[PDB]
Design a protein around this ligand. Structure first.
Ligand code: A1A9U
Length: 167
């Protein structure tokens, strides 16, 4: 039993809610919140900009030190950093950005990072301003992640479309 509330069960291990991931994290304080990051951990907009703003820019400060030490992530890769006031940990995961011309097949590799964590609060990777098809991303999530994932989908119209089309 966990403290996630109001989710629709999609499969044995995947759950979904029309909610802002920032608000879900504030309420639940999950062990792991997933950020939809880029390879430079520049949290300018989208999920990343919203999470970082909620940390009062502490996520960005920590991220800049991470990059200075380690260099950029790979597309499809991840790193574990602090969750600050939102969660114990933040798993920064880089899905392919279609608006940058990145290969959509790397989306499966991106979701594989979730399997290193027993329970996660996550956004839909590569959706929104990353330019991929959200129906496809939900499908890849369900077919790749085996651990327990709670998907917060902020956009109400998108949430309705995802539920009504889910096979
Ligand atoms: C990768 C990506 C970037 C930009 C947008 C989206 C779409 C999703 C779903 O609508 N956005 C969100 N989902 C959950 N919590 C959120 N908080 C603020 C925005 C937001 C995906």
């Amino acid at each position: 039993v966990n403290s996630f509330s109001g989710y629709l069960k999609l499969t044995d291990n995947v759950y979904i809610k029309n909610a802002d991931i920032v608000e879900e994290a504030k309420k639940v304080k999950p062990t792991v919140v997933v950020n939809a990051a880029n390879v430079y951990l520049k949290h300018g907009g989208g999920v990343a900009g919203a999470l970082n703003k909620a940390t009062n820019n502490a996520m960005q400060v920590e991220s800049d030190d991470y990059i200075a030490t380690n260099g950029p992530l790979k597309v499809g890769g991840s790193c574990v950093l602090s969750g600050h006031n939102l969660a114990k940990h933040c798993l920064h995961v880089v899905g392919p950005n279609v608006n940058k011309g990145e290969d959509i097949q790397l989306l499966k590799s991106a979701y594989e990072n979730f399997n290193q964590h027993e329970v996660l609060l996550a956004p839909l990777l590569s959706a929104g301003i990353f330019g991929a098809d959200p129906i496809h991303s939900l499908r890849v999530c369900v077919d790749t992640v085996r651990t327990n994932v709670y998907l917060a989908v902020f956009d109400k119209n998108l949430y309705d479309k995802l539920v009504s089309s889910f096979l």
